[PDB]
Design goal:
virus entry into host cell (chains A, B, C), 9-stranded mixed sheet, binds 2-acetamido-2-deoxy-beta-D-glucopyranose, alpha+beta, homotrimer, elongated, 6-stranded mixed sheet, 3 domains
Chain lengths: 480, 480, 480
C-alpha cells in the first residue's frame, strides 16, 4: 500500500505521493589496506606438479601487484559536480612520505584503527586481506629455505582461494581506470561493509537505513585505487552520507495536451516539462529532473543532491493551478498531435490524438476502456496493460488510491491563430508575454495606418507658388 | 542480404532498405527456482585442511543466500514505460501465502512444469540448480550430525563447481539491486534458454527466430529477484515476445544541408530530424528514433516498440517529396556553417562547408575524392575511410547497391532575409508559417511608408504668410 | 604539470589550461586466437572421481565452443560514425577460405606473428590460449586410447585453470552480442596487450604513451567475436591509434548568467553552450562537447575525434570578447532565475540567484565566504566545499594557479522588454537579429507618431484660397 496518486485533467499531469526521502548530501571515505610480501622471485626449480601450481599461482600474485602498481602512475540547467573529488583528495594524502607507515603502524595488532593524517583529518583505516602472513608463514618457509617442497595438495587450493580476492580487485580496477562503481563484493564484502557502516560518524537512523539497503549503498559508492607502496595496497572507499531522511517525496508525471477540434495539423499542444522527483528539504524543495539517477526501494527514494535543484515550496502550486501568480510553471509548446502513454506509479496517463487506437486491457477480460481523443487517465485497479498505437505498455501493480481531478484542459483557452507553437522550454508567463507582445504590435500598427487620412499632399514642384482652396493646390498667379 | 541505399541530394538524406523486422511487442515471464538445503548455522569445525576448504565453501553458500534474503525486503516526445512492470507483478504474487509451496510441489517430479497461480495466470516454472540434493546426499551426511570426515579431495573440487553458479547469481543481483539486464548465462544457460523458447506459446517462426539469435534475446531480457522462502530461491526471467516478424524495415540517415553562396556566416542550414529505424507494422509505420535501442544482425533488425512512435504510412512521402501536403516532414534550421559526416549502411554522407578539407580515401591509393562545398555522398565501393576536418571515419564494408538521386538542395528555395534560422525542432509547414508572418511584418512596414510619402510638414510660425513652392514654404510677400 | 585557470566574470565561465592531448585518430585491428581440440562425445564410462571431474570440465569446454559458434551466425550536431566498422571488416576477411589456415600456420612456432591478409592489410596475430596441445598431449592420451585413467589430481586443477579463460571469454561475449568494451583482461591480459602495443606500426612516443596508460587503452578499445572454424576461435581486438599527442588542451566550464535587478521571474538569463574539451590539432581546434567521451589521467587528456567538431582557431575569441565579429559564439537564453554551481579543475563557479544561500567552506574554519546574487568564483586554495542551496559540492584539491578576470555580465546589455528568452541553442548574432527586428518596429512606429503630430490638416472647403500662418489656415484675400 502507502501510495496515493492525483491526476489533473486540466494539465494532463499526475503526482504520486507517499514516498520517503533518502538523499545523499555528503561523502565519507575510508582507506582499505592489503598487506603484501613482495618480490622474492627466487624460483626454486623442483619440477613437482604441486610446486609448479604454487609457482604459477605466485606469478598471478606478482602480476596482480604489478597491474595495480601501473594504475597509481529538464536534464540541462543542472549543476556539474565532481563525484570522487572527496575520495581522490585523500589519495593525495596517502602519496606523501610516511603516511603509509602511519597507518601501517596503527594496524600492527588490530584489524581496525582510526589514523590522524597530516591534513588534519582522522580517517578510518582497516585491513581486509592478510596475504603477508599466509605466504611468509604457511608457504615460503616450506619453499624458500627448506629445499623446495609442497607437502599437501590442499595448500595449492588454499592459496588460490586466499589469492582469488586480490586477483578480482586488480581485475576490477584494471577495466575501470582505478575508479569503480558500484562497490563490488570483492572491494568490500557484506560483513565488512556492515562493520564500516556501524563505525561511521553518523546517526542511529543513518546506520539503520544503510544496513537495511546495503545494495543501494553499493550503487551509490565508489572505490578509488590510491597507492601500492611499502608492501601495502591502499584503496579508498567513498561511502554516501544520507543527511536528509524520512521527508515526503512525490513524483510528477506529464504528457502532451493538445486540442482535438482543429483541422489536420492545425491543433496546438502544450506539455508541463518539470517532471521528476520532488522532496521536502530544509524548508525548500529538491527537484530531481533525471529520474534515472534515483533508485526506488518500496516507498523509499534514494536520490543524489548533486543532480538536484533547490526550489521554493510554491512550486507545488503548479499541480493545482498552472496559472498561479506565485510560481511561473514551465511548459513546452508544439503542433505535433502524436499519441503516447506515460506509466505512473499506480496508473497510466494516455494522450490519444488522431486516428490512433488507444486502449486499456485486462488479462482476464481484455480491452476494458477505449480512450477518446484527449488526455485521459486510468489506474491499475483492474487494468494490467495499456496500448497506444503499436506499443503495449505494462502497468505497475502496486496497490494504492487514485484520485481523478476533473477540469477543463488549459490548451482550449488559447487561440491557435496567435499561439507560439515553437517553445522548447518556456513558461506560462513567457507564453502570455509573447501573445501580449504580438497582439500589441498588430493593434498599434493598425491604429497608425488609419490615422493618416485627411493630411495634405505635396503641391506640384514646377517653380510656381500654390495656395490651398477646395481641397486642392491652385496657382497663386490665378488670384492676381 | 541485399541492402540497397538511395541518397537524396535534395534533402541531404539517405534511406537504407532491404531489412527485416523483429519487433519486441510484449513480454513472457517465467519463474526460475533453486532448491536450497536449510542453513546449518554451525557445522563441524575441524582443523583438517579438506574440512577447512569445505567449511569455507559452506560459508560462501551461506553468505549468498543471506545476500539474496536481504534483497527481497527526436526521442524527447516518446512515451515513458516501466519495462520491468510485468515481471515485478509476478514477484508480487509469489510473496503471497503458499504460492511458493504451490510451485515447490509442482517441481518435485519434473525439472519444469506449468503452475496456475491465485492471480489466474498460468506461468511456466522450472528448477535450475541441484544444490539441495548434492549437499544433503553426498556432502552433508558425512559431515553433519556428529561426524567430520572429508574423504576425497575431489568432493572439495566438485562442490566448488556446483556452488559457483549460486555465488555468481547472488553476485550479479547484489550489484544490480535485484534487476539485471542483459540476461547473463548464470541466470539462464544457453541450453536452458533454448529449452524455454521451445516451450513458449509462440509460433514456429518465432521460436526459430529466437533460437538463431540467442545473444539478442539476452540483450532484450531481464532477470528479477523475487523471494527466498521455504528453502528455495525464486526469481523471474522476463523474455521478449516478437509479435512482428519479417516485415520490411529501412533506416533514414540525415545530415546538415547548408547554402554555400552566401557570405561568411550568412548561410542558412536545414536538417531532417527524423533519423532512425522505420518498419511496417499493422498498416502503420513504427518509428524508432533512438538507434542505440535497436540491434542489427545481418539484414534483421531487433527493436523495441516501447521506444517507438506509431506513425501513418504517409510518413514515407518525406523521402520522395519533403514538401508534400499530406504529411508535415520534420526539420531543424540553423546558421552554423560547420562540417560533419554520417556513416550510413553502405556509404557515407559528407557535409563540407567553409574552409574545411573533406576527403574520401582508399587504404591502398590514398585520397581518391576531394569533396567540394555542399552535401555529397559516396559508397563503400573502393572507399575505406572518409575524412572531414580532423576526424577520420571508417565506412562500413557491407556490399550493396547505392543509387545517387540527383536533385536541387531544398535550402536554396528559401530567402535568407526572412529565413528563421533558430528552430530546434520544427517542420516544413511551421517554417512556412513563420516565413508568412515575417513577410507580413515587412509588407506592413511597406504600407506605412507609402502612406506617409508626399505629406507636407508645418510651415514656419513667425506671423507671416507662407505659400508652397518647389517642396518648400516661401513667404507670400516674396510674390507681392 | 602547471594547471592554470581564468574565470571570466563577463560570461560566467572558466577555462582550465595546461593539459596535453592524446586524440584517438584511427584504429588498429589485431586477431586473437584460441586453439581448440574439437570435438568428442566419446567419453569412456570409467566412473572414477578424477575422471568424472574431467568429464564435467570437458562438457563445459564443449559448451563454450558451441556457445561461441552461434555468435558468428552541444553534441546533437555531431557526426555519426560506425565505431567498429574497421574491426568488423577484418572479421569479414576471416570468413574467406584459407584465411584462418594462414593465421593458424603463422602461429605454429610462435605466440605472436604478423600475417598478411587477402585485402593487403598486415595484422598482428596473437595466440593467447593453447588448449589443443594440452588436451591432446597431456589429457586425451590416458583417456581416449589408454583405457580411461586419470593419474594425478594436479591435471584436474591444471585443466580447470587452463579452461577458465575460455569460459570467461564465452560468457563475456554471450552477454554483449559478440562486441565488448572496455577490453577486459580475460580478452587480453596486461602483458599480451603490451606485447601488441609495442609491435604496432606507430612511433616510439605513441608506444610509450599507450604503455604507461594501459588502463585508458582498454577504455577505448573493442573486442569483436569473428569466427569459430577449423578448431580455432578468432576475435578481433580493435585498438586506438593516437595520431595527435602533446598538443595543448583546455576545458571550458560555463554557468547560467542572470540579472538580479528585476523582481521574481522578470529577470533574464544567458548561458554559454560550448562547454567541453578543446585541443589544438593541425592548425585548427578540435572541440569535444561530450565530456564523458574524454578520459583525464593527471596531465593528459584522452579524447576521441569521432565525437568532435573541427573548429577554426577564431573560437578562442569567445573567451576574450564574446561580441567579436569573426566567430559567432553560441549561447542559450531563458527566464529561469535558478541557482547552481559548476566544479572546475582548481575551483568552483557559483551562480547564486533568488533567495538561495550560497557558501564556500573550509574543513577547519567552516564558512569563509557567503556569495551574493550573481555569478562569482572561488579557487580551491583554502576552500574544500561549496554549498548552493541544499546541495554540497566538494571541490578538487589539485594544486594550480587561478586568475579572476573582472568583467561586466553580458546579460546587462539586453533590454528585457525585447529579449528573446526562448532560445535553446542560439548565438550572439542570432539573438541580435531578433532584437533588431523588434527594435526596428518600435523605432519606425515612434518615427510616425511624431511625424503625424507635425502634419497639416485640411484647409476649409469654402471656395476660398488659404495660406499657412502661425499654424492656421488664413484667407489669402486678407493680405490683399
Ligand atoms: C498586455 O498586458 C497588459 C497587462 O495585463 C494588458 O493590460 C494589455 O491589455 C495587454 N495587451 C494586449 C494587446 O493584450
Ligand atoms: C502562407 O500564405 C499563403 C498565401 O497567403 C497561403 O496560401 C499559405 O497556406 C500560407 N502558409 C502557411 C503555413 O500559413
Ligand atoms: C542591427 O541594425 C543595425 C542598424 O540598424 C546594424 O548596424 C547592426 O549590424 C544590426 N545587427 C546585426 C546583428 O546585424
Amino acid at each position: 500500500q502507502n501510495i496515493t496518486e492525483e491526476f489533473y485533467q486540466s494539465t494532463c499531469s499526475a503526482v504520486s505521493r507517499g514516498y520517503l526521502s533518502a538523499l545523499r548530501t555528503g561523502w565519507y571515505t575510508s582507506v582499505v589496506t592489503i598487506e603484501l610480501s613482495k618480490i622474492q622471485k627466487n624460483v626454486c626449480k623442483s619440477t613437482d606438479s604441486k610446486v609448479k601450481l604454487i609457482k604459477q599461482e605466485l606469478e598471478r600474485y606478482n602480476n596482480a601487484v604489478v597491474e595495480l602498481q601501473s594504475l597509481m602512475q529538464l536534464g540541462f540547467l543542472l549543476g556539474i559536480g565532481s563525484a570522487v573529488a572527496s575520495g581522490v583528495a585523500v589519495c593525495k594524502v596517502l602519496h606523501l612520505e610516511g603516511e603509509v607507515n602511519k597507518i601501517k603502524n596503527a594496524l600492527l595488532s588490530t584489524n581496525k584503527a582510526v589514523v590522524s593524517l597530516s591534513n588534519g583529518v582522522s580517517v578510518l583505516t582497516f585491513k581486509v586481506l592478510d596475504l603477508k602472513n599466509y605466504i611468509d608463514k604457511e608457504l615460503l618457509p616450506q619453499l624458500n629455505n627448506h629445499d623446495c617442497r609442497i607437502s599437501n595438495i590442499e595448500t595449492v587450493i588454499e592459496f588460490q582461494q586466499k589469492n582469488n580476492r586480490l586477483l578480482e580487485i586488480a581485475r576490477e580496477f584494471s577495466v575501470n581506470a582505478g575508479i569503480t562503481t558500484p562497490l563490488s563484493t570483492y572491494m568490500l564484502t557484506n560483513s565488512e561493509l556492515l562493520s564500516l557502516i556501524n563505525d561511521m560518524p553518523i546517526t542511529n537512523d543513518q546506520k539503520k537505513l544503510m544496513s537495511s539497503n546495503v545494495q543501494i549503498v553499493r550503487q551509490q559508492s565508489y572505490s578509488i585505487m590510491c597507492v601500492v607502496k611499502e608492501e601495502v595496497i591502499a584503496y579508498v572507499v567513498q561511502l554516501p552520507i544520507y543527511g536528509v531522511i524520512d521527508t515526503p517525496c512525490w513524483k510528477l508525471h506529464t504528457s502532451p495536451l493538445c486540442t482535438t477540434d482543429n483541422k489536420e495539423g492545425s491543433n496546438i499542444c502544450l506539455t508541463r516539462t518539470d517532471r521528476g522527483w520532488y522532496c521536502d528539504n530544509a524548508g525548500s524543495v529538491s527537484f530531481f529532473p533525471q529520474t534515472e539517477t534515483c533508485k526506488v526501494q518500496s516507498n523509499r527514494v534514494f536520490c543524489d543532491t548533486m543532480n538536484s535543484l533547490t526550489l521554493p515550496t510554491d512550486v507545488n502550486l503548479c499541480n493545482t493551478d498552472i496559472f498561479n501568480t506565485k510560481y511561473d510553471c514551465k511548459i513546452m509548446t508544439s503542433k505535433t498531435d502524436i499519441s503516447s502513454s506515460v506509466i505512473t506509479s499506480i496508473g497510466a496517463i494516455v494522450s490519444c490524438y488522431g486516428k490512433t487506437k488507444c486502449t486499456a486491457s485486462n488479462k482476464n477480460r481484455g480491452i476494458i476502456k477505449t480512450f477518446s481523443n484527449g488526455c485521459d487517465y486510468v489506474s491499475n485497479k483492474g487494468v494490467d496493460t495499456v496500448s497506444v498505437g503499436n506499443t503495449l505498455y505494462y502497468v505497475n501493480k502496486l496497490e494504492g488510491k487514485a484520485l481523478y481531478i476533473k477540469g477543463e484542459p488549459i490548451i482550449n483557452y488559447y487561440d491557435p491563430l496567435v499561439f507560439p507553437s515553437d517553445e522548447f522550454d518556456a513558461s506560462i508567463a513567457q507564453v502570455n508575454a509573447k501573445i501580449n507582445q504580438s497582439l500589441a504590435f498588430i493593434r498599434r500598427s493598425d491604429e497608425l495606418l488609419s490615422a493618416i487620412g485627411g493630411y495634405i499632399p505635396e503641391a506640384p514642384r514646377d517653380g510656381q507658388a500654390y495656395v490651398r482652396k477646395d481641397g486642392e493646390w491652385v496657382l497663386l498667379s490665378t488670384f492676381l
